[PDB]
Amino acid sequence: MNIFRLTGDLSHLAAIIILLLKIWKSRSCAGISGKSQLLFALVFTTRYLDLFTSFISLYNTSMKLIYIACSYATVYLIYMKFKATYDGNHDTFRVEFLIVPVGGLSFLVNHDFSPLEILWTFSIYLESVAILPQLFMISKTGEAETITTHYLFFLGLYRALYLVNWIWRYYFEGFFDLIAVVAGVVQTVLYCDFFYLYVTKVLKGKKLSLPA
Prior knowledge:
Pfam families: ER_lumen_recept
InterPro entries: ER_ret_rcpt
Keywords: KDEL receptor, trafficking receptor, membrane protein
Radius of gyration: 17 Å
Number of domains: 1
Largest sheet: none
Number of helices: 9
Helix content: 55-70%
Strand content: under 5%
Distance between the termini: 40 Å
Shape: globular
Lumenal side: 1-4, 53-58, 111-116, 169-178
PDB class: membrane protein
Order of helices and strands: HHHHHHHHH
């Protein structure tokens, strides 16, 4: 553990709770891409199969279970409990264009040709593009509520802090994983437009339009 990974992980949990309580309290999933939430749920399901093979720490086990629980819980609120407010007409991103290529790439570009390693690699490739349906839906519809931009900020900030974590771990422990780093850089660069607009508009009381 270093303070970058921990703050990244706290940023990630914050993101997930904010989105969960926004939907819970307002009893609506207005402006939320169900499809992005399916992808995050699929990312945690393929990444955390090592719950069955490895005990790292109680923290590590706990967060994996919290992340899995909240991801499935968010998909439940969107597609069952509050489906009445699910804007299916504007959440039109074709997710097959992420899943099939990422699946294909996870099979051909990996550290090891075993089922657990391939599914991990899949989790890492998929997380890098998981937010595109959410960002596309905002580009399409008018704007995002303030609370949604805060979710996107903290989610975006989480993997940005992992990059710093990876700099720290390379310098200090000689640890490097180029599949996680490259995917991490893709994941983070996809938040650049949103980050700019969040700083210059949302933190200045303006709202955050992404034309296209």
